[PDB]
């Protein structure tokens, strides 16, 4: 229910059992005066923020202080007050004990009025010797005092047979009290005279008395169990002014205190816990001639009666009340609304409804009347208390069958919204960076300088700059120069010379850093220099010296580096000069600057040296100049691009300068550049559609936040306005995470609802014709507090999991496949019906699922049907309408649930789909499109029993092969076209993540790519063009295609990752090792013979006649060679500098390197320890220098050929960890790690390597160059003996 703005719960509670009373004896009074610790007649009240005692509550006695406070001479602080009170009460006890000895007066009933009056007169310093003879009752408490007369008129006054006594305080203020926001309310009970009490023995006499007495201020009475017998209470004109902005007189304050006590007692009620009184509320009997309907007294009476009948507040009542809480409650009481309850106060008596749980009418004997025809429909149950949630909580809404017009929903959303506001943005890309590189290889074909791609002509547009800046401002990473330099250096130091067999770059060589910058990080130099010198970078041995040059340097020389200047020769040159400063915003001038920088770096380098240059804008003139004036003068080159932000920058590395050669651009460089530009174009298109970094949200941008706020919610009987507003918010952001919060702000209770919108939400919105309303039960149940939180656009702070990326790839493919106005048959849709946001807004959909759906049914605009039945069963496919069929991430789980092989499941699915009317089938399939390998931690493959295991989810599914599925489909549809949708290497699906306020990382993307390698999407086109595969589609082998149904004038062309692999118009101009094409007229067939070089998925297209629209064929998959590797060791080892040579067998296609695992990281072993070369018969030989430390390290062999490392080959060398050290030779020794190790000879310890107090033994010898993975760790030569290292 709801009453004038006060929300009420939907259940009723009440106390059940009263507690009996004990009378008050002289022993009890003496004990009360004793005031022993823990039993005192007072109790302190503390400020809720500072925690200082600010007031005290007075129990019995000390309920008689009715004079001005300066008359008692009280102290100011709590402790002084305690001491003063104890000392005075002790003397009072002795004075009262002199009259009534405890020996024969210990069990006698004492007059409460006389006790209170005696204490007050003692403390106020007036005569009380007329009070002691009345201490012990003789007939009745009131009868003894009604007859005394005017002698004691200072305390008691008798108007015949009714005794008037002035009400005493129940609270007392200390000096700290300051009307603070956190001080406890005292309800005007701390004043001199807030009220007067009239005691009699019967109610009729009291009514007769009050007939001829004033009653305008209002008369209150307890009916259940009054304190000192029957009495009426009359309020004076004193007021409470501690609850701003309100001023409350005595009557309303007393009513309010009683009402709150009753509500709190209602909430915490048990059937077997006695309470002092079953009804703590006051009733106003005489004086109700002067109550206005809009007054506070009328509504206080309504609340009092409601609390009597068992109602509960929806908000939590604090254990100790404070002024802000009371002010908020009173502000809620006076708001707008009506009393929805069927209970209205009436002067004559109190009403108890028939369904009320209170049993007060049976406890008492006069005052409460039960109404039979008055009924309440409510469950009887007490509230369950909960603590307040510090952050907003999620909320899943559920829709009823109600409907409304969309326009009214938009109007209510406009009314309730809290926009505009400035939120926090967050980061759109977090985590570590990766690198993509290409090198020179002679197995590729020759590419001229005009076939190479160039940067887009619109690179410098205003919105392009906006996109680049937005991407750069919202990516979290460390110093970018350090990352780029580390990647480039680690790539450069491991290139192998062709004719000598060593690395180009070696340790202890001169280095020149051109373009070094101080920077405003306090280092005053490039960061990567410092570790490089100390050898903290594995695989990068330190140089002899480093010299810095540039305009903005701090520890070098300021010089213009494009013109001759005095400087010697250097064996390695690293350039990082940008072409922006000197180049006057003209592109050709920047290209000329690149040329001059290349000439300068060529002159500065000694013959046999090496250099690195950075290019900001790769243009075709630059490629031509490099081709004509540099390449015929170096030995080898490579290109690197460490991806930190969205750029077209590139690094060019030249090895072996000042030497003749015949180097040319190759096809691999063409592929590298094509993908390098495509990735930038896609990411720019995505990131130009995001809001500005630090914008103000008005609701106008497609991507943004939405929020609404409602004051004093009315969930119980929600008016259509609030329900329509909440439904409008739900319609704007559908299928997005939603949060709610309930909190107090400025004397109100407020509900706030927040979510985020997106283009998918707009698409789902455009499909509605009406507005489906929600079920408000979940909100009206809530009876707690949830504190709010700051709004942030990108709430996620870690990056999407690879499973989410795989699902986004599948969803993007589904969205792209469906054109406009095409009937869709979706199989296995979830309850939430994601498909409604992917297909366009004019395409009818039929979702088939075994589980019941959650989406509403009558609000939609076009056909939208949901069916509850398994899709692999027969008897239903004849009667559905569809053309494109979608089944994603459902077939494997369904086949595992029924415990059948994947072949049988696919056969059954194709059987049911044969009888349909579909044209295109899109099925997510469990089948490998490469060699079978396991992704540790995310997917494991069991080949003997074909079985995919998913450890992140603890799930299991079967799988099959391409041959079986292709044979099944070719049997079902004799002329279909099967394609394997290529989603690897493509970044378009990211449009479904960054535009939904979701944060991505690069490593998760790579994991998703590697998982999609084994779970492709098979797309079958029913009426397609048959073609046949003949050879073994393996890298390097001969593979053939047989294509029918074409003439002698037709043209073919193949595509490999958005780059034209080859064509038939110009056969020799291809980028594939060997292609040939023949035509046969009698069979009318095209025969294509090919030899491939790179594994992947290739697509084919055909051009017929003069048509401008090309007809698309299927696609095929080209696989990598075998991954079986082995090693063989000689019988007699070698422990000298020459080392031992082991013969290893592996396919020549792979490039091998050796690594080691340290603290969960991968580190490159030294090139001084392992050397790979070839023998006469071509057998691969590996030369290794055996080390004692190798008894405690495990070395791995991994392939480094492609962008991934270690996915195809990861071979541990076991026989290196199990060598037997000779006892009569000189051995190499080195510290295995950075920990301290103890070296022991025959159990006699020698020294502790890495210890601070380590001194070299006299007979040990040092090695000129180390063989340890860490270049900082030195190598020693140890004499004959057997040694052991223990990791201290």
């Amino acid at each position: 229910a709801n009453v004038w703005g006060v929300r009420l719960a939907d259940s009723l509670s009440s106390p059940t059992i009263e507690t009996r009373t004990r009378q008050y004896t002289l022993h009890d009074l003496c004990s009360d005066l004793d005031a022993n610790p823990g039993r005192e007649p007072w109790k302190p009240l503390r400020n809720q923020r500072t925690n200082n005692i600010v007031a005290v509550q007075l129990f019995r006695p000390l309920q008689g202080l009715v004079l001005d406070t300066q008359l008692y001479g009280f102290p100011g602080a709590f402790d002084d007050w305690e001491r003063f009170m104890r000392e005075k009460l002790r003397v009072l006890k002795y004075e009262v004990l002199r009259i009534y000895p405890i020996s024969n007066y210990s069990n006698e009933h004492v007059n409460v009025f006389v006790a209170n009056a005696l204490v007050g007169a003692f403390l106020s310093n007036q005569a009380f010797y007329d009070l002691l003879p009345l201490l012990i009752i003789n007939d009745t408490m009131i009868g003894d005092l009604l007859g005394t007369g005017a002698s004691l008129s200072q305390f008691f006054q008798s108007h015949g047979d009714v005794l008037e006594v002035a009400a005493g305080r129940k609270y007392l203020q200390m000096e700290n009290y300051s009307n603070d926001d956190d001080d406890p309310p005292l309800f005007a009970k701390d004043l001199s005279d807030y009220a007067k009490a009239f005691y009699s023995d019967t109610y009729e006499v009291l009514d007769r008395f009050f007939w001829t007495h004033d009653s305008s201020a209002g008369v209150l009475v307890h009916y259940d169990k009054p304190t000192n017998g029957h009495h009426y209470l009359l309020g004076t004109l004193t007021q409470m002014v501690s609850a701003p902005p309100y001023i409350i007189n005595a009557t309303d304050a007393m009513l309010l205190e009683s009402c709150l006590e009753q509500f709190s007692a209602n909430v915490r009620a048990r059937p077997a816990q006695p309470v002092t009184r079953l009804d703590q509320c006051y009733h106003l009997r005489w004086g109700a001639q002067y109550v206005g309907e809009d007054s506070l007294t009328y509504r206080l009476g309504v609340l009092s009666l409601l609390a009597t009948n068992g109602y509960q507040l929806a908000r939590p009542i604090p254990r100790q009340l404070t002024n802000r809480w009371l002010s908020s409650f009173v502000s809620q009481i006076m708001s707008d609304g009506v009393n929805e309850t069927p209970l209205w106060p009436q002067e004559r008596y109190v009403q108890i409804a028939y369904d009320s749980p209170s049993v007060v009418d049976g406890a008492t004997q006069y005052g409460y009347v039960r109404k039979n025809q008055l009924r309440l429909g409510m469950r009887i149950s007490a509230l369950q208390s909960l603590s307040d949630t510090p952050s907003p909580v999620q909320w899943l809404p559920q829709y009823t069958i109600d409907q409304a017009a969309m326009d009214e929903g938009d109007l209510m959303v406009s009314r309730l919204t809290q926009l505009p506001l400035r939120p926090d943005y967050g980061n759109i890309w977090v985590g570590d960076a990766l690198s993509y590189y290409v090198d020179y290889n002679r197995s590729h074909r020759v590419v001229l300088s005009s076939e190479l791609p160039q940067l887009p002509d619109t690179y410098f547009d205003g919105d392009e700059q906006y996109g680049r800046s937005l991407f750069s401002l919202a990516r979290k990473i460390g110093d970018r120069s350090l990352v780029k330099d580390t990647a480039v250096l680690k790539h450069a130091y491991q290139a192998i010379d062709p004719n000598t067999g060593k690395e180009y770059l070696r340790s202890r060589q001169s280095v020149a850093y051109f373009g070094a910058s101080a920077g405003h990080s306090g280092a005053d130099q490039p960061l990567v220099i410092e570790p490089w010198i100390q050898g903290k970078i594995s695989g990068v041995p330190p140089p002899s010296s480093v010299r810095q040059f540039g305009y903005d340097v701090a520890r070098g020389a300021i010089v213009d580096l494009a013109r001759p200047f005095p400087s010697g020769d250097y064996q390695f040159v690293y350039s990082d000069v940008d072409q922006v400063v000197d180049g006057h915003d003209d592109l050709s001038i920047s290209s000329g600057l690149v040329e001059s920088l290349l000439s300068s770096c060529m002159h500065a380098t000694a013959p046999g040296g090496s250099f690195v240059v950075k290019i900001n804008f790769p243009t075709r003139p630059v490629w031509h100049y490099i081709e004509q004036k540099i390449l015929p003068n170096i030995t080898s080159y490579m290109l690197i691009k460490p991806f930190v932000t969205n750029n077209v920058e590139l690094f060019f590395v030249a090895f072996g300068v000042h030497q003749h050669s015949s180097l040319t651009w190759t096809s691999g460089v063409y592929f590298f550049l094509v993908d390098h530009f495509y990735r930038y174009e896609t990411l720019s298109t995505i990131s130009r559609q995001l809001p500005s970094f630090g914008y103000v949200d008005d609701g106008s941008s497609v991507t943004g936040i939405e929020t609404i706020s409602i004051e004093n919610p009315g969930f119980s009987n929600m008016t259509q306005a609030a329900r329509i507003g909440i439904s409008g918010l739900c319609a704007n952001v559908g299928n997005a995470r939603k949060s709610i919060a309930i909190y107090e702000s400025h004397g109100a209770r407020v509900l706030t609802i927040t979510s985020r919108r997106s283009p998918a939400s707009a698409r789902r919105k455009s499909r509605l014709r009406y507005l489906p309303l929600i079920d408000p039960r979940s909100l009206e149940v809530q009876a707690r507090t949830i504190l709010p939180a700051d709004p942030v656009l990108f709430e996620n702070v870690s990056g999407a999991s690879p499973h989410v990326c795989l699902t986004m790839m599948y969803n993007f493919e589904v969205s792209s496949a469906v054109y406009d106005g095409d009937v869709v048959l979706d199989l296995g849709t979830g309850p939430e019906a994601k498909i409604l946001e992917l297909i366009p807004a004019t395409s009818p959909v039929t979702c088939v699922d075994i589980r019941p759906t959650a989406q509403p049914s009558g609000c939609w605009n076009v056909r939208t049907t949901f069916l509850e039945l398994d899709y692999l069963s027969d008897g239903w496919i004849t009667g559905v309408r569809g053309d494109i069929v979608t089944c994603m991430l459902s077939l494997g789980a369904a086949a595992a649930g029924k415990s059948m092989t994947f072949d049988a499941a696919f056969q059954q699915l194709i059987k049911v789909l044969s009888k349909s009317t579909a044209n295109v089938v899109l099925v997510q399939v469990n089948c490998p499109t490469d060699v079978v390998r396991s992704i540790k931690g995310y997917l494991e493959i069991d080949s003997t029993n074909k079985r995919y295991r998913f450890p992140k989810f603890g799930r299991d599914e079967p799988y099959s092969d391409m041959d079986a599925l292709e044979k099944i489909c070719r049997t079902a549809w004799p002329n279909c076209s099967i394609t394997w949708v290529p989603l690897s290497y493509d970044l378009r699906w990211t449009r479904l993540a960054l535009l939904e306020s979701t944060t991505l990382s690069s490593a998760s993307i790579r994991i998703a790519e590697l998982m999609y390698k084994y779970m492709p999407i098979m797309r079958i086109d029913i009426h397609g063009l048959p073609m046949e595969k003949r050879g073994n589609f393996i890298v390097g082998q001969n593979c053939s295609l047989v294509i029918p149904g074409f003439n002698a004038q037709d043209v073919f062309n193949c595509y490999f990752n958005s780059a034209l692999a080859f064509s038939t118009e110009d056969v020799n101009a291809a980028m594939i090792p060997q292609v040939s094409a023949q035509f046969d007229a009698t069979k009318g067939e095209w025969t294509l013979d090919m030899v491939f070089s790179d594994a992947g998925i290739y697509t084919m297209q055909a051009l017929v006649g003069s048509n401008a629209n090309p007809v698309s064929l299927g696609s095929f998959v080209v696989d990598s060679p075998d991954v079986d590797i082995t090693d063989a060791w000689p019988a007699q080892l070698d422990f000298t500098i020459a080392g031992t040579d082991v013969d290893i067998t592996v396919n020549p296609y792979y490039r091998l390197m050796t690594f080691v695992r340290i603290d969960g990281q991968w580190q490159i072993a030294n090139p001084d320890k392992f050397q790979f070369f070839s023998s006469a018969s071509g057998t691969l030989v590996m030369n290794v220098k055996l080390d004692i430390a190798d008894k405690y390290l495990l070395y791995y062999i991994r392939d480094v050929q492609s962008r991934d490392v270690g996915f195809y080959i990861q071979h541990p060398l076991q026989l290196l960890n199990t060598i037997t050290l000779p006892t009569n030779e000189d051995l190499f020794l080195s510290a295995p790690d950075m920990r301290e190790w103890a070296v022991k000879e025959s159990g006699n310890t020698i020294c502790i390597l890495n210890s601070q107090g380590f001194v070299l033994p006299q007979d040990w010898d040092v090695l000129t160059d180390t063989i340890s993975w860490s270049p900082s760790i030195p190598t020693y030569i140890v004499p004959p003996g057997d040694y052991t290292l223990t990791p201290l």
């Binding site: 028939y354 369904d355 749980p357 009924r375 009887i380």
Partner: protein, 42 residues
């Protein structure tokens, strides 16, 4: 129907004092049909 229990209730399905006494003058209809002819409604 069925049997149940509540702490406070208004009617007793399984209790005493209920009447079941079909009559001709009482009968039982809800809304078998309504007249919604196209000629009448315009």
């Amino acid at each position: 129907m069925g049997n149940a229990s509540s702490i406070v209730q208004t009617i007793n399905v399984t209790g005493d004092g209920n009447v079941f006494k079909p009559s001709a003058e009482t009968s039982s209809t809800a809304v078998p049909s309504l007249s919604l002819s196209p000629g009448m409604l315009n």
